[PDB]
Structures are given as structure tokens and as C-alpha cells.
Amino acid sequence: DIHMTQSPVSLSASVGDRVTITCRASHFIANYVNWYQQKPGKAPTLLIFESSTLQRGVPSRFSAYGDGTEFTLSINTLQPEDFASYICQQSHSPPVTFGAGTRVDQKRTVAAPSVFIFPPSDEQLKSGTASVVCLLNNFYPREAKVQWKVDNALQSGNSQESVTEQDSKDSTYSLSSTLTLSKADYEKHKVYACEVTHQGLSSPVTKSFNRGE
Amino acid sequence: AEQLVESGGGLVPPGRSLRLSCSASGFYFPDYAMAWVRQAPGQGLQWVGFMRGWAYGGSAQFAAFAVGKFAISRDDGRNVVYLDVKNPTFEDTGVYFCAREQRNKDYRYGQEGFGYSYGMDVWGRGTTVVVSTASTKGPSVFPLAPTAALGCLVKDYFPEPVTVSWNSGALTSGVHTFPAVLQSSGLYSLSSVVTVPSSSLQTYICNVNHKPSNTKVDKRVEP
């Protein structure tokens, strides 16, 4: 199969910026590339086909070009409704294959998150499960590292993340991380910690609680 | 104008054959080759396969993983394309889009090579498929006990959506209700939070409503 490699993974830009997104094909595919836009919860929208033909009804600030191996999507100039993900696709031969996407969001100043930790309620444990929740509030950029620690033992594979869409008025993100443990496991240990690493923090921030107190 | 609409299920049992339907309107469907493209939670687009119109032989091709495990057929008089999944597993969870391949300037697909190079110009809204043994149900609401922050954990529900407000709408400043995330059980879970001055600990009540199960819950969040 032909593999499509999109860079960068993530891009921060301002209204009025000229934005350039790149897709690389593992094989020479001449002009057989399409570009799509996708916004959260929606189907993709075709922007470009045959690497540079603008799709009817798509605004002319979108253009694209390629050389058979490297293909470039250009937004000139970026508009508010253009903060979205962009996806390349080769149409050269089956199986059809897509790039992994490039996220374009709105640039703002670096903002560190406010971190909070929540123990599981007393009612949930009665049902046999314990959810521990870590909240990262109002930060930028979106990249954040959350490490769960239980009695100072690093956790892997038992948490789930959720990130808001970029806030409309202040361009920050908020993020939730939820650690799930059986009740029995939750009561064999004492100290529950959430450690947050972020560009805005001079060093990692840790919030924690001891069970029962 | 031109429109596709997928149907065929939220929670579906593993191992039982699954049929999705894509109904077309607003265009002459039998002229068009039709594709199925799926998107697992948090993942990128994955082409499942496509089928040509009758005038190009009506053959179908699939991604390597999908060969022999999925099937596509069309009923042109009913303006519908189908995707059949034999033996679905958790790996088949995601949103399934139906899409048509655009024809070129000359109302044609390409004459040389593959020929489907004018982009997928019409897409359905997508149908969420979750392969699991779980059943439809409303959510359990648990408090997230307390500048300070508190919230509500809205856990184990299907399908989307739920709506969450705070103090019946009177509290909006600092509220963040997070996108639902799918758990390994096949049920959704979500948290709603708000930051608040630690002196005010004012009363705090989250009001979660889940219409598909006729569930309304108001939970008091105290320290």
C-alpha cells in the first residue's frame, strides 16, 4: 500500500497567517492527491483534487501543489472557520489511503494549566469501581503530559483522557484524565497522585490525596 | 441537495453479522462509485472499500484487512449501498461514513489507471457503531468532591447525547463539560467541572439529562 505522512502533526496560527501543510507519499504518485478538511464530530469536506484543482464551492484562499512525492496544502490567508484538521489522501491506486491529519488551531500565549485531583465518591465505590479524576484547566498549547501515580507506582494503560475543543473566547484547552481501578485495588493503596508536565510550568506539578482523609 | 445518510446501529453484539445502509438522494446514484470509510475513536480516516457503478463493471475492492471480512453491495432502484461486516469485533468500533467518488469535468471517471481521482465530494454524516455486549442505559452521576474546583462524573450511558447544566443554568462561569469518551465496556463516560472560589463553599448542583433513556438527575456536590 501507499503510505501518506502528514507534517506537522499540529500547527498554531493566527487569523491572517499564511499556513502551509505537507504530505509525503512513500511512492511517486504524480498528481493523484486529494485534500480534506475535518472539524470535530463532522464528516470531511473535499478541498482539492488532483493535488491542485480547487473543488467547486471551496474558497480560493485554499490552494495546493505537489511534485509526485511531496504535496503541500496552503491557506492564504487563514480565516476563523479554518481552524480544523486537514487530511491528505492518495487517489493513485487501491487501497485508498489517508494521512493521519494535521491539526490547525489558533495561536495564543503560553498558559499553564490549573491542576486538580478528585477522589472517587463514596457512592461509586459501593458499586465496585473507583474513578480517580485529574483536571487540567485553561492551558495552551494543547500538548500536556499526565502521569498517574499510586503509592508512587507509575500507572500505565488504565486511564482515559478527554480534551475540550479550543475555547472560543480565550483559545485555551481543558483536559480531564480518569484513572479506573477496581474497588479492591483502590483500597490496597493510600496515596493517589496526578503529575502534570506542561510547557507553561517551570517544573512538573503534582496534586494528590490520601484515601480516607 | 446531494445527500447520503447512513443507518444501521449504535451498540451491536460482537460476532453477529452487521449490515449498514447508506441511502442516497439528490443525485443519480447509479452513476457513482460508492466508498465506505470508518474512523475509530480518536483515530484517522480508514478506507474500508468501495464499489463501482454498473457501467464500470460494479466490481468492489477493499483494504487488505477488510478483504473477505466485509462486503459491499448496492440496490440502485432503492438508491442504497450496504456494508456487511461478518463477525464484528471491538476493533470495528467507530464512525462509518459513506461517500461517493466525484466524476470529472466530462461527467466521467478517468480513462487510464484507477480512474477515481476527483475526490470524495459527498459524504454522509456518519453512523456511530460500537461493538460491545453492553445495553442501552442512562448514566450514573457521582460528585467530584471539591480558587477551587468541583464537578459531576456522568458515567456509563448509551447512546449520546447527554446535557449538563449547573444550578439549572445559573452557573456558567468556569464550566467545562468534556466530550464523551467511549470506555472499554462500550458505554460512554464524561465529567463536567467548574472552578469556584474556595470561600463560596453557595450550593452547587449539576443537572444532567439523558433523553434517550428519559433520565433526569440533579446531584448535589458538597465537600
- Classify B183 as helix, strand or coil: coil
Q: How far is residue B73's CA from residue B83's CA, in Å, rounded to a whole number? A: 7
The cell 447508506 sits on which residue? B22
Burial zone of A9 (CB within 10 Å; 0-12 exposed, 13-18 middle, 19+ buried): exposed
Put simply, the answer to whether A124 touches B140 (Cβ < 8 Å) is: yes
Q: Which long-range contacts (CB under 8 A, 24 or more apart) does A157-162 make?
A: A160/B181, A160/B183, A160/B189, A161/B181, A162/B178, A162/B179, A162/B180, A162/B181, A162/B190, A162/B191
Burial zone of A195 (CB within 10 Å; 0-12 exposed, 13-18 middle, 19+ buried): middle
Regarding the domain delimited by B134-223, which CATH topology (the fold level of the hierarchy) does it fall under? Answer: Immunoglobulin-like (2.60.40)
C-alpha cell at B177: 463539560
Which DSSP symbol is given to B30? G
The contacts of residue B127 (CB under 8 Å, 6+ apart) are B6, B7, B8, B9, B20, B95, B96
Q: Which of residues 146-205 of A touch B (CB under 8 A)?
A: 160-165, 174, 176, 178
Chain B residue nearest residue A98, CA to CA: B45
Q: What residues does each domain of chain B span? A: 1-133, 134-223
Chain B residue nearest residue A179, CA to CA: B183
Closest by CA position to B75, among listed B5, B24, B26, B16: B24
A78 near A63, Cβ under 8 Å?
no
Closest by CA position to B94, among listed B12, B15, B191: B12
A47 near A73, Cβ under 8 Å?
yes
- Name the method of structure determination: X-ray
Chain B residue nearest residue A116, CA to CA: B149
C-alpha cell at B103: 466524476
Number of Cβ atoms within 10 Å of the Cβ of A154: 9
Cβ-based contacts of A38 with chain B (< 8 Å): 45
Nearest CB neighbour to B117, from listed A32, A38, A114: A32
B209, β-bridge pairs? B163, B216
Chain B CB within 8 Å of residue A87 CB: yes
C-alpha cell at A57: 464551492
Q: How far is residue A103's CA from residue A39's CA, in Å, rounded to a whole number? A: 10
Chain B residue nearest residue A92, CA to CA: B114
A83 near A89, Cβ under 8 Å?
no
Put simply, the answer to whether A97 touches B47 (Cβ < 8 Å) is: yes
Q: How far is residue B213's CA from residue B138's CA, in Å, rounded to a whole number? A: 5
For residue A51, give the amino acid letter: S
Distance between A183 CA and the closest CA of chain B, angstroms: 15
- Classify B169 as helix, strand or coil: helix
**Structure resolution, Å:** 2.0
B98 near B25, Cβ under 8 Å?
no
Instruction: Give the phi and the psi of residue B215 in degrees, each rounded to 5.
Output: -110, 120
Q: How far is residue B5's CA from residue B8's CA, in Å, rounded to a whole number? A: 10
Q: How far is residue B23's CA from residue B1's CA, in Å, rounded to a whole number? A: 14
Sign of the Cα pseudo-torsion (B50, B54, B55, B57, in order): positive
Q: Please, what is the Cα angle at B183 between A182 and B146, to 5 degrees?
A: 65
A169 near A159, Cβ under 8 Å?
no
Sign of the Cα pseudo-torsion (A52, A55, A60, A62, in order): negative
* Helix spans in chain B (H): none
Q: Where are the beta strands (DSSP E) in chain B?
A: 3-7, 11-12, 18-25, 34-39, 46-51, 60-62, 70-75, 80-85, 94-101, 120-123, 127-131, 140-144, 148-157, 163-166, 175-177, 181-182, 188-196, 205-210, 215-220
Number of Cβ atoms within 10 Å of the Cβ of A184: 9
Alpha-carbon Rg of chain A, whole angstroms?
22
Cβ-based contacts of A131 with chain B (< 8 Å): 142, 153, 155, 189
Put simply, the answer to whether B121 touches A95 (Cβ < 8 Å) is: no
Chain A CB within 8 Å of residue B178 CB: yes
Q: Which long-range contacts (CB under 8 A, 24 or more apart) does B64-68 make?
A: B64/A1, B64/A95
Chain A CB within 8 Å of residue B67 CB: no
Cβ-based contacts of A137 with chain B (< 8 Å): 149, 176, 193, 195
Q: How far is residue A50's CA from residue A32's CA, in Å, rounded to a whole number? A: 5
Q: Where are the beta strands (DSSP E) in B58-161?
A: 60-62, 70-75, 80-85, 94-101, 120-123, 127-131, 140-144, 148-157
A102 near A9, Cβ under 8 Å?
yes
Nearest CB neighbour to B97, from listed A43, A95, A163: A43
What phi-psi label fits residue B53: left (phi over 0), alpha (psi between -120 and 50 degrees) or beta?
beta
Interface test with B, best of A3, A39, A162 (most B CBs within 10 A): A162
Q: How far is residue B141's CA from residue A186's CA, in Å, rounded to a whole number? A: 20
Number of Cβ atoms within 10 Å of the Cβ of A89: 25
Put simply, the answer to whether A131 touches B142 (Cβ < 8 Å) is: yes
* Helix spans in chain A (H): 122-126, 183-187
- Classify B213 as helix, strand or coil: helix
Residue B122 to residues A171, B2, B112, B174, Cα–Cα distance (Å): 31, 7, 23, 39
Burial zone of A145 (CB within 10 Å; 0-12 exposed, 13-18 middle, 19+ buried): exposed
Q: Give me the torsion for CA of A71, A3, A103, B192, rounded to 10°.
A: 170
Q: How far is residue B146's CA from residue B132's CA, in Å, rounded to a whole number? A: 34
Q: Dump the DSSP string for A155-188.
A: P-SSEEEEEPPPPTTT--EEEEEEEEEEHHHHHS
Domains, chain A, with CATH or none = 1-107 (2.60.40.10), 108-211 (2.60.40.10)
